[PDB]
Amino acid sequence: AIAKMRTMIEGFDDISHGGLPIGRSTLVSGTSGTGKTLFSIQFLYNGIIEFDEPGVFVTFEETPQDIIKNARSFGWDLAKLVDEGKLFILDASLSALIERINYAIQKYRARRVSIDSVTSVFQQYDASSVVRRELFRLVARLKQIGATTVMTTERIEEYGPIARYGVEEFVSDNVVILRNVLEGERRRRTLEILKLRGTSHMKGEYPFTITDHGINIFPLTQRSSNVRVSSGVVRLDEMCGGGFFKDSIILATGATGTGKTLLVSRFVENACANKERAILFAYEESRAQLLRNAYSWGMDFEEMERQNLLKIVCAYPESAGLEDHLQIIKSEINDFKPARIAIDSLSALARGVSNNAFRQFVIGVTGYAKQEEITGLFTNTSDQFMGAHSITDSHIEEITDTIILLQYVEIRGEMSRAINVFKMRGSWHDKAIREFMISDKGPDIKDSFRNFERIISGSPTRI
Amino acid sequence: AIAKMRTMIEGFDDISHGGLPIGRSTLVSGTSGTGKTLFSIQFLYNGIIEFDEPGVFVTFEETPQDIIKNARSFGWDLAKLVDEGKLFILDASLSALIERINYAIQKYRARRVSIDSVTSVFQQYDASSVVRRELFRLVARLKQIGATTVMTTERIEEYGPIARYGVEEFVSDNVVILRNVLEGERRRRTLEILKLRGTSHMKGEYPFTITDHGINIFPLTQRSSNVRVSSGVVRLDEMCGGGFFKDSIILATGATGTGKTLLVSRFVENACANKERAILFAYEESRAQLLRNAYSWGMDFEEMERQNLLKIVCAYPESAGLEDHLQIIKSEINDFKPARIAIDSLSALARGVSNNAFRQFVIGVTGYAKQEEITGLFTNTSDQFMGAHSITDSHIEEITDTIILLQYVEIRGEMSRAINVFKMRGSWHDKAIREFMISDKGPDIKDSFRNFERIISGSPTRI
Amino acid sequence: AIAKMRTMIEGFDDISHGGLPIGRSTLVSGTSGTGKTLFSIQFLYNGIIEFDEPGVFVTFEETPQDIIKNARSFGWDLAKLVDEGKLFILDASLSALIERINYAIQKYRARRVSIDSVTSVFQQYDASSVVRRELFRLVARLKQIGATTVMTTERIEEYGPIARYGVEEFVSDNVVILRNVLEGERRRRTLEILKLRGTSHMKGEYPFTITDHGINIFPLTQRSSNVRVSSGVVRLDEMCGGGFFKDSIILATGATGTGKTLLVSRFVENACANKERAILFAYEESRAQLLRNAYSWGMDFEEMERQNLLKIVCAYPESAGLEDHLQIIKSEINDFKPARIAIDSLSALARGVSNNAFRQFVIGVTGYAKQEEITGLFTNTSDQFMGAHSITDSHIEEITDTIILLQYVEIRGEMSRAINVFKMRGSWHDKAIREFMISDKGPDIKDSFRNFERIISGSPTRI
Numbered sequence A, B, C: 001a002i003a004k005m006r007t008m009i010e011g012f013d014d015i016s017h018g019g020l021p022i023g024r025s026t027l028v029s030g031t032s033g034t035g036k037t038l039f040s041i042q043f044l045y046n047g048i049i050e051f052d053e054p055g056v057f058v059t060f061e062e063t064p065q066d067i068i069k070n071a072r073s074f075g076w077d078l079a080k081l082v083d084e085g086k087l088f089i090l091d092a093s094l095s096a097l098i099e100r101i102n103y104a105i106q107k108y109r110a111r112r113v114s115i116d117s118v119t120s121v122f123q124q125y126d127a128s129s130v131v132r133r134e135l136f137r138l139v140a141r142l143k144q145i146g147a148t149t150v151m152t153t154e155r156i157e158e159y160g161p162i163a164r165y166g167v168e169e170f171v172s173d174n175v176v177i178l179r180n181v182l183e184g185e186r187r188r189r190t191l192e193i194l195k196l197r198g199t200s201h202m203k204g205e206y207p208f209t210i211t212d213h214g215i216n217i218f219p220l221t222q223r224s225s226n227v228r229v230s231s232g233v234v235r236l237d238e239m240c241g242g243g244f245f246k247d248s249i250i251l252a253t254g255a256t257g258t259g260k261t262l263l264v265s266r267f268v269e270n271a272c273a274n275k276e277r278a279i280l281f282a283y284e285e286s287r288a289q290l291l292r293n294a295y296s297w298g299m300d301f302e303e304m305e306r307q308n309l310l311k312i313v314c315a316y317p318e319s320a321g322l323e324d325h326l327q328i329i330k331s332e333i334n335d336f337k338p339a340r341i342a343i344d345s346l347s348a349l350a351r352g353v354s355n356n357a358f359r360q361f362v363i364g365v366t367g368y369a370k371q372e373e374i375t376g377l378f379t380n381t382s383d384q385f386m387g388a389h390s391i392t393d394s395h396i397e398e399i400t401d402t403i404i405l406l407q408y409v410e411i412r413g414e415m416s417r418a419i420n421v422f423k424m425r426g427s428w429h430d431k432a433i434r435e436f437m438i439s440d441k442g443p444d445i446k447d448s449f450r451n452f453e454r455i456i457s458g459s460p461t462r463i
């Protein structure tokens, strides 16, 4: 096996199966604005913070003052690290460069080296053979010195050659690719480990986000128990065999206006009533509209929000990508430590996105909720309000544990509502589909449609 | 006919119809990180291990120390082979190179030669005619010496020119292509024999995987008997004419929440009850959730797992490709030697993949199960819970031998379940569709819906 | 008109409408491994064998020893032809080359000349004008000498320029293109005559295969009679007005598990019972599984196979392309001389292929069966087991003469089977759809569903 230096970057050590190999060069290639400089800075910063390993950052484009000023936005005080001698910033804006880097490593006992852009040096030569030869010389000398080095290079096209000259991949022992894919006028950041000589790794592209704390890569044994939480509606708990499970994931799917937001609001209100903290992520309604609707339902969200029990986070789905929404949800969960989380609509997050990306987002959110033992209440909007046979437009049914189905039923020329417990993993539940009503006091559950047939199609026939 | 030297690489001799021709050059071309160095190392290593044939590995990019260090991750002690004189590693980091290779072949009685990258030598020349001339000289000299040589070259594009200069294919007698296709943010490794002068071979691309033992290529007369195994449910055995066949493949397809995992769990529990070893591959639920659900069904998986009778392997479908899942399943089957294997969901493995790839995966798994005389229990999730007419979204019905159909039936405003034996190859089975119930004691099978019509559509009408 | 020299290559003279023009140059262009060398060798070999016309093969890449060694795999003893003086192999690994070729033609009285690769000579020049001028000189001199010449050139892209320099097409009188198209990870060989100056030809691409006998091109007045063969089921013969026709093509289409393989097995068993030879091509089941299923049906295939009456050929559809399957079927038919041929499933061959290619394959197989007066029993699997309205997923209904329809019918909560004679060309047949049963003694045909309506949809209603 090969010893691996943990980069301590969130999620990178998972895909790399223990981190970057010790003493081997890693080349991170990407287009402008992908996060190469941030990756190289965070490598050294996390190394210094977690293991006291000195770092040397050799820069070519940005001045050291610019590097420190940019890092200050992340809370990283690189200036005090330079004063303490833990971090060194070499200015290089090839043999002499390697000699100076070696001298810096010797003087500061550096364990990690970062090279901001070797491409700027290679700009002086047009032949790819010369670039390959000089990169091989640099990598060989770095390996001989024994310092783990992370160099970054530039790309012209997202889906094309891995590097500018097409020969950098064949030289470096380790290759990592940062991509900023523009599709549907939306930008998505992806990370892909192309080649790790001598060790296994995860294969493919995984989304990552840049936040105030740096890079947060999402590298896509959950515990279970018999403790049952209360949804908030007594009939909905009786139908579920004694309420939802603590670790369960509940998905309430139905057409617009069937009462998904009402169930979400009752879930949050019941969470806060038992002195538990709850988070409500809203994507179809604003905070004031939610307050007015809750007041129409006889529920005071203002009092529970003043007590810091309920946190309502409202944003438009189009304001950020799905991975950004996942990162925001995770950050809010970490900051607030909630017992329950609810989402106003997954279909709102599903607007204008591919099925695979939405499924990945749902899998990530549900896995994080189960890992943190947080009761999650997701909701989904069906495209057709009657005659729908697919539970969800994007198949996420297998992911969830408990499913609630809300639908419209046309009876006597009136649009009544029907609610049913579609499935519950590990628990008995009522199979009947029952009439669902909404009034000033909230939701009510009535008897089932025993006298009707073809109820699922939305246009039943009395028999 | 042409004599062929067996490469002993798993699956390569099947597609090459006996191995690489003796005394002829084979050029393996691919992009960075496809497995060219691994292929060339494994060729010589397997030759030495299986036939005591000495091997010579000429390297250009990696140092011999790097080669040995990388090989050590596979358990290949190349250093002791160098000490024993069976393996030689020439360092070349063109006529002089050929003279040194010939001297190494003469001194060590080499039978196999591997060339890591002739492209690095060709980098010195830009004209494709010069590259073609020098490659022809090298191949002609290698043929004159009589050593079977495997050279590797580099590619820039996966679907484009076969080699960097576009002339390497017209020189070498044998051409093999390694591709690392990136599609849907997922990487897939493929192997394609382009041209074998003088001999037949399989045509097209076949998936291969890199594991701790090296390359495991999957090159996509099964025996039958009348011995009948027990599923675990007595009614499901009565309906099947006395249980499933030992060599049969059973596919239980239905909507979410119909009871596929219950049948899989009963299958595994009955396998382990008769002191047989069983494997359960889970993709929709974790180990703890499976344990809790089994406990809710009155089945103790913990006791049977402590006895090393049941092996539960749980992973996310998105963590690896379909060929990787097939390799993992095969490795677990080889390590555990199970009588029965069960899969929690094929549709989970079918997320975000093409129909052809999923069908190939199913064909491979079923063929391996039948070849090893292992009773396999596959399950499939239908997109629509009612009104579905296609048995499976991806047509794999022809592959399977026995099919069980689970469906939802809306009767009296309640979602009951129906189970039916769709087909059984070589055995009589009950044609009735019977009511299916789930309780604390497990599954129950009741009388059929004799009084209803259009049961298949999911919304029957009492007649 | 122009006199044409028959190349004697199987299927080439059909598309070329009598062969290559005499005294005119033909340039065959294709990528690596398409079959250019094989085409040029087979041209001279077939000329010598069939008309005693001496041939001269001028080679540039392969040595004459390599050429003979490669040809020996096809059974072509080129060495004895060189000794006899019928064949000459000139080694050239431009004016001097033409002088030597002319001397060889004069000395050996050569009538056909083949040039393995003029592209290798043209590699010395980069200007396309020089290549065009020298190729024009070569073609003009060859025409002046009066020898029919087949030169081959190289291509970089399958769908792009016809030749490397883009000027070879405008020089040569005749242009032929060999393509090796890679699509869906599958390779397909195609042949296309681009331009024949002065004569007509077939237009477009036609599949061809390379086998142990060389190139077998498939260039896509059938006789009829009133002799009626017996299917094997007496009721199925009564319904068909006295059995199938000898020259008829029968297609039995239905869902999985309806009994297509049972009908195929009964067809083969009845063929062999009357001392006729029969061939069964299996693609969904192995030989042992077929034997076990036949034994369950009371039919002993082993005894009839020992008598060399029945030949069972089993293979996976994914092991070869559709044209390869057609070639294998034709070769087996030629070797065994069968009275009847049966196919276990056309839909198995239809996996992962385009509709047009499958239709071409079906047309070819049916035309060959009708031309050879062989009774063919094809079968097709429908995607939907109920409610299907298209007879076949890929429309091949017009091709066939007799159609049998098998379907599932849900009656009284049980999945019964229905069989119907959809159509019969030139013969009266029963229009009723009758109940179909399978038991230990085989198939049984019962009364029709006179009391039901909407039987075709699979969910009838008693009236």
Ligand SMILES: Nc1ncnc2c1ncn2[C@@H]1O[C@H](COP(=O)(O)OP(=O)(O)OP(=O)(O)O)[C@@H](O)[C@H]1O
Pocket (backbone or CB within 6 Å): A031, A032, A033, A034, A035, A036, A037, A038, A039, A061, A073, A074, A210, A211, A212
């Ligand atoms: N505090 C921050 N919060 C959020 N995003 C930030 C923050 N600081 C920087 N970024 C983002 O980091 C991205 C990458 O910045 P970086 O300096 O690493 O560029 P780069 O990938 O090295 O590019 P180049 O080589 O073209 O200079 C920028 O596009 C910017 O949007």
Ligand SMILES: Nc1ncnc2c1ncn2[C@@H]1O[C@H](COP(=O)(O)OP(=O)(O)OP(=O)(O)O)[C@@H](O)[C@H]1O
Pocket (backbone or CB within 6 Å): A255, A256, A257, A258, A259, A260, A261, A262, A263, A284, A293, A296, A297, A381, A438, A439, A440
């Ligand atoms: N005071 C009230 N009395 C009766 N019904 C009410 C009252 N307030 C709201 N409703 C009902 O609430 C329904 C909408 O419920 P909800 O806010 O949960 O929406 P939803 O089903 O989640 O869909 P979406 O947010 O996409 O519109 C409306 O159709 C309306 O009939």
Ligand SMILES: Nc1ncnc2c1ncn2[C@@H]1O[C@H](COP(=O)(O)OP(=O)(O)OP(=O)(O)O)[C@@H](O)[C@H]1O
Pocket (backbone or CB within 6 Å): A169, A170, A171, A194, A195, A196, A197, A198, A199, A200, A201, B031, B032, B033, B034, B035, B036, B037, B038, B039, B061, B073, B074, B210, B211, B212
């Ligand atoms: N022990 C291992 N387990 C799993 N995968 C491994 C292991 N060792 C190496 N690999 C994989 O083998 C792949 C190919 O490695 P290899 O050294 O053969 O590269 P290559 O195809 O010759 O590339 P290049 O010519 O760019 O150097 C790497 O991308 C790596 O992911």
Ligand SMILES: Nc1ncnc2c1ncn2[C@@H]1O[C@H](COP(=O)(O)OP(=O)(O)OP(=O)(O)O)[C@@H](O)[C@H]1O
Pocket (backbone or CB within 6 Å): A397, A398, A422, A423, A424, A425, A426, A427, A428, A429, B255, B256, B257, B258, B259, B260, B261, B262, B263, B284, B293, B296, B297, B381, B438, B439, B440
């Ligand atoms: N103790 C129990 N009593 C009654 N029913 C139960 C019990 N435990 C589970 N169930 C039933 O099991 C059903 C789900 O069964 P199972 O775990 O086999 O799922 P499945 O059909 O394979 O689908 P998926 O895993 O995709 O959700 C639920 O709908 C629920 O009604």
Ligand SMILES: Nc1ncnc2c1ncn2[C@@H]1O[C@H](COP(=O)(O)OP(=O)(O)OP(=O)(O)O)[C@@H](O)[C@H]1O
Pocket (backbone or CB within 6 Å): B169, B170, B171, B194, B195, B196, B197, B198, B199, B200, B201, C031, C032, C033, C034, C035, C036, C037, C038, C039, C061, C073, C074, C210, C211, C212
């Ligand atoms: N006995 C055989 N059986 C089956 N296929 C064969 C046999 N002999 C040769 N082939 C096939 O013939 C194909 C073409 O071989 P050939 O020597 O004609 O190459 P080519 O088209 O002239 O290529 P190039 O110009 O690159 O050398 C090979 O790819 C090989 O797979």
Ligand SMILES: Nc1ncnc2c1ncn2[C@@H]1O[C@H](COP(=O)(O)OP(=O)(O)OP(=O)(O)O)[C@@H](O)[C@H]1O
Pocket (backbone or CB within 6 Å): B397, B398, B422, B423, B424, B425, B426, B427, B428, B429, C255, C256, C257, C258, C259, C260, C261, C262, C263, C284, C293, C296, C297, C381, C438, C439, C440
């Ligand atoms: N001994 C038997 N008794 C009764 N029915 C039998 C017997 N053996 C087989 N069958 C029936 O044969 C059916 C399958 O028939 P067959 O082998 O012809 O398949 P098919 O319709 O060609 O489809 P496929 O090969 O795609 O599964 C099964 O549904 C089963 O009910």
Ligand SMILES: [Mg+2]
Pocket (backbone or CB within 6 Å): A037, A061, A062, A116, A117
């Ligand atoms: Mg920069």
Ligand SMILES: [Mg+2]
Pocket (backbone or CB within 6 Å): A260, A261, A284, A285, A344, A345
């Ligand atoms: Mg809402």
Ligand SMILES: [Mg+2]
Pocket (backbone or CB within 6 Å): B037, B061, B062, B116, B117
């Ligand atoms: Mg290498």
Ligand SMILES: [Mg+2]
Pocket (backbone or CB within 6 Å): B260, B261, B284, B285, B344, B345
């Ligand atoms: Mg399940």
Ligand SMILES: [Mg+2]
Pocket (backbone or CB within 6 Å): C037, C061, C062, C116, C117
């Ligand atoms: Mg050739």
Ligand SMILES: [Mg+2]
Pocket (backbone or CB within 6 Å): C260, C261, C284, C285, C344, C345
């Ligand atoms: Mg069959």
